[PDB]
Design a protein around this ligand. Sequence first.
Ligand code: MG
Ligand code: MG
Ligand code: MG
Ligand code: MG
Ligand code: MG
Ligand code: MG
Ligand code: MG
Ligand code: MG
Ligand code: MG
Ligand code: MG
Ligand code: MG
Ligand code: MG
Lengths: 55, 57, 142, 57, 75, 141, 144, 185, 100, 66
Amino acid sequence: GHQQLYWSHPRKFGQGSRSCRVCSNRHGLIRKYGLNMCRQCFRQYAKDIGFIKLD
Amino acid sequence: VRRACYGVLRFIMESGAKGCEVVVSGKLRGQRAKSMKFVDGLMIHSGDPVNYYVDTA
Amino acid sequence: GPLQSVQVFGRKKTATAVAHCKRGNGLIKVNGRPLEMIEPRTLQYKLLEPVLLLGKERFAGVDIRVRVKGGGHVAQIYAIRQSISKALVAYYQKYVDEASKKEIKDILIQYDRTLLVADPRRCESKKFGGPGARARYQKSYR
Amino acid sequence: MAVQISKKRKFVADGIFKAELNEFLTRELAEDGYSGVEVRVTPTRTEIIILATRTQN
Amino acid sequence: RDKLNNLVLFDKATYDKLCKEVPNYKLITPAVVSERLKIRGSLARAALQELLSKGLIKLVSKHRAQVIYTRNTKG
Amino acid sequence: GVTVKDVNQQEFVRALAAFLKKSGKLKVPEWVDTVKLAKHKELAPYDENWFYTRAASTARHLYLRGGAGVGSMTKIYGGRQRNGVMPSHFSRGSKSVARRVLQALEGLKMVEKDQDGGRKLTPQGQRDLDRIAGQVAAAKK
Amino acid sequence: SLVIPEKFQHILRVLNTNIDGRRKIAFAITAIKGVGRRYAHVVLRKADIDLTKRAGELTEDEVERVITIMQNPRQYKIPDWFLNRQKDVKDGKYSQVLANGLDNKLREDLERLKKIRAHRGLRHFWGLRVRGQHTKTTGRRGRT
Amino acid sequence: TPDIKLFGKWSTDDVQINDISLQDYIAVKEKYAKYLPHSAGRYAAKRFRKAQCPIVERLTNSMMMHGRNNGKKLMTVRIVKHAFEIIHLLTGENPLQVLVNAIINSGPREDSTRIRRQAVDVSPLRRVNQAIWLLCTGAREAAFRNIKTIAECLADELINAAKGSSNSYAIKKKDELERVAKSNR
Amino acid sequence: HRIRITLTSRNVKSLEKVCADLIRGAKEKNLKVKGPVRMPTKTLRITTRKTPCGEGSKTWDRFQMRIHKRLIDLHSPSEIVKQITSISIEPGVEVEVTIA
Amino acid sequence: GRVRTKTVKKAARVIIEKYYTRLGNDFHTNKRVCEEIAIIPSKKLRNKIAGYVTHLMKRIQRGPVR
RNA sequence: GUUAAUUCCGAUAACGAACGAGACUCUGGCAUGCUAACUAGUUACGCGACCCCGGUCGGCGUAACUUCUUAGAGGGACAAGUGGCGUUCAGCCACCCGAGAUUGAGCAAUAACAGGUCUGUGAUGCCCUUAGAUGUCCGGGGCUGCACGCGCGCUACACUGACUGGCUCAGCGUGUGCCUACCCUACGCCGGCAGGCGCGGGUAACCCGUUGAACCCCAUUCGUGAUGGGGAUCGGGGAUUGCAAUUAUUCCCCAUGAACGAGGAAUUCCCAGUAAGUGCGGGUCAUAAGCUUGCGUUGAUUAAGUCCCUGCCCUUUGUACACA
Ligand SMILES: [Mg+2]
Ligand SMILES: [Mg+2]
Ligand SMILES: [Mg+2]
Ligand SMILES: [Mg+2]
Ligand SMILES: [Mg+2]
Ligand SMILES: [Mg+2]
Ligand SMILES: [Mg+2]
Ligand SMILES: [Mg+2]
Ligand SMILES: [Mg+2]
Ligand SMILES: [Mg+2]
Ligand SMILES: [Mg+2]
Ligand SMILES: [Mg+2]
């Protein structure tokens, strides 16, 4: 049926399973320290998180 | 746009600021992207004091 | 009776070597083994340099134990080289007269500044856009 | 805590908490004069002060 | 163009020449012996080790890259 | 007397290899003569009794520091992994060869398994190591 | 020993392939196809051979023993993982094949791929990279 | 030996520098001779601090070249030591004196440059640098693709340069540069 | 009796003020106190591209986040530790009180 | 180049104009004097101002300053 | 005139100013002094083990202390002292004392490009489509295709090297997840290896881990031969990840053993712990480093200058250019 083909592909791995938590896109994801967000929004919200370019 | 930037700048100079910089970018008086810039007062740009001496929006 | 313990560190780029002088006989050992077996053996006379410059009479009354960590081979060798000399200078400053300390300091300085003064040169940070600190990647026109 | 998260992930999660908080209140309190937030995380109580201009609004 | 056809083992004349002239050389090292006698370097090293076993040459400083031998003492 | 640290180690491991040649009861495995000692090595060793020499090296490493299991043995016997067209990296050694070395040194009492994991060295092995240290000292004197 | 002995073979002849007697035995066997450095050292170790000797000093009954050990790996205690025809398709026997049957079984494997008409056999017939290589930038010196 | 210094087994004294032009720029006598040609560094900080570096250390530093050998100073200390052994066992003199004579003979007194090329006489420090480069380049060219080792080649090049028999590559390039500068002046 | 306060903070001088205030509180309440033991700090390093797209010169950011962890051992019952940690806390410092 | 800027030089001239009696020849004395009398936020700027104070005091002991 | 600098001195129809540079922040080093420490240790003791009173132990436990450990407040260096040059001003060079007498990065002004990004966005105007969809889901393929050319890189062309054993030293770091299904691994057996099977430790100065990393050092084998250099291509087999590896995902074993003998015109990057050699972490990662970003080891040649080329910044000059 349609219920057995709509969301039956395995999403246990890969970059298509995870996404950004702002853009929900699947490119340039920062998975380090559980950020799980793209580098553009990381540059956007690094001041709000606490990251700062000291050196 | 001009009167609104004049009003915002006059209000913040009435409140009391060391200096300001109002940049309105976009399409004005036509299709070509014209960017207006209103600067007066003491305003610093470079160095570590830009982190905690100015407020940027 | 009184313990004449002198603990003096010596630093290269990363290697830190702490020498320890006491009252005793003329034996010098580094990490539980003497100076005659510290590889590479090409820098054996470099290890023997304070003994060869000062004679066995100065080192006869001092026993030196050195604990070493960090760096590479030449770094640890030059670290213990600096550290045993600085430890002997500090021991002769603390427990005997300052004139012999000044003469031994003159003998060490007239040979090499590295025996007493550490080198402040350390590794420069690598920058983005290059395989090293100063070098860049190969720029390709056209 | 039973999940036992590390401090490396915990301060990052608090930063993303403050970021999503600031963005949500920027989108929602925009017409009312939003100016910021300040969150004091105490044990068993979470004080979270909206800093804004028009308190009646 | 050029090819070095060195001897893998001793000829009789080359062995007599190594017994005659090589303990009279000031440089007794296997590369120089191989260059002068057109033999292998390993063959030269085994030859100098057996000359050490016989007792006609004097060791100066041996090493994993190069061993150094010279003549016997003069007096 | 003397310890093994006053002794030059390069001839000391060969002297303990000669001591294991003199003893001859380590119960060597059957696959000694044909195996390659690591995944990063390319050939078999030139020496026919590499097992005794590496057991000597294992004895002096466990004398210097104990609690070294099979992972630490592969760490001390790792090396360059020449990947050919790719750049080289560090590669750990073979596990089973040092495992058989530790089983031989547990068979004849030179090492003993210690609590909280690892192999330490027994006082009988310390006695044998200091006796052969005195032997190499008397040889170099 | 150090001089040239009697009956010194400058070139040995084993399995229609010349062997340089100047070269050391564990490397002089490597001129034969199907045997390399590792399997040569395994054969010389499983036989009672001083491997310091050259390939001209050793005797003819002993090189016949070397030939029998190289032709029969299983019967002289060599494991199955030193072999280049582990679990063959046609007969299923762990064996070491030397310098003519190697090319024969290679062209028979190419003929089997040609018969089954696989993509692997098609890339072999075309003369291209079959293990999945990128032929866009490399492989130009072979084709003109 | 606390008073007099021994370069390995070699004496500091009895090293006569023939050229008085190369007296200060050859740092070999009574202050700069050490136990090993290895050292810590700092000689490349100031301009004329390179002249105070000892000449055996300068040969040790200039020997390590061509990619695969950059940063093997213990290894080229071994090379220079065995080369001094071969120099003593061939010539029968002081290897330090042979090296000083090799620098004096191999150093070109003039060169030519663009001010058409005009010839000018070079600085003595530049002459020492050119000699150290040329004899090292000749030794490496003799050692590349050869049975003769690098210590034997460096010993033969230093002995041929101290002799001046025109069989050394350094002496040949010195004569070539001197002849070109004699021509275009 | 042996109660362990762990102080984790991003700012430096605020954490120093908090640990000094805990030292002054222990000195006023008269208990055996250990010194403020510093841990080696952690530098969370992120290196991304400056450009949102990929077309530009190869420029790279260095986003740093330094976190610091001090610890203070107290020889006192639980109510004293709760009374000390209840008073004068500021948002930069996270406090973890271990009983054992 | 170790060239002093105007924020060093004018502030040092104001310090010497207001506190000529307190300042002296020794760098480590009049550096602490300038630290006491002037609110300087950073040690490097403080050292620059104190060094230019010492140099102008040498100029004053040599002769008149414009 | 001076400076890395529109940096200052000084002249002066200019005066008073402002951004930038500088100043600032972080990093690197020096403080046998202050604060600290059972998630770092030190040295003394008490035992234990071994060798002939003494030596070793990262074997155990405790007695003061912080030299080594880490991180906080401070301090220290400023052309300050001397000798010269210089309007005796701005400043420049050398030297003594000394850990430094130019450590490195971040930030970075006005004005602009019709430079890149609508394929980062639930930033977006307009246009197109909107159910037989350019929306969304599933299966397979492709993004890897190969007569050709270019660019960034890796491997090398060997004897200053390769192979085989022995010795011996690091620092950045990271590590069990909101969805999320995927962590670092000690140790004991099975197997040659890739790996597999069980007990543990670790949310991290606790465990991996004293991070037993390479280059290098020592000792054999090789002998100038496209050779034991080099490992491309290709056959046979064995394992892990995943629902699924065929167009070989990767890894391991045997075998096959190509060009390449230091590279033409042309051209890149760099001057001190620098280039280069060399290995280790993060990102992409279920499986995964020839890339990139950081770190550590060994560690130099030559230069302290110039506008010759390529360009840049001031002043004057000329212009028939001003999308210059
Ligand atoms: Mg500014
Ligand atoms: Mg700035
Ligand atoms: Mg190793
Ligand atoms: Mg050669
Ligand atoms: Mg455009
Ligand atoms: Mg699909
Ligand atoms: Mg592509
Ligand atoms: Mg091409
Ligand atoms: Mg090879
Ligand atoms: Mg080959
Ligand atoms: Mg990439
Ligand atoms: Mg005109």
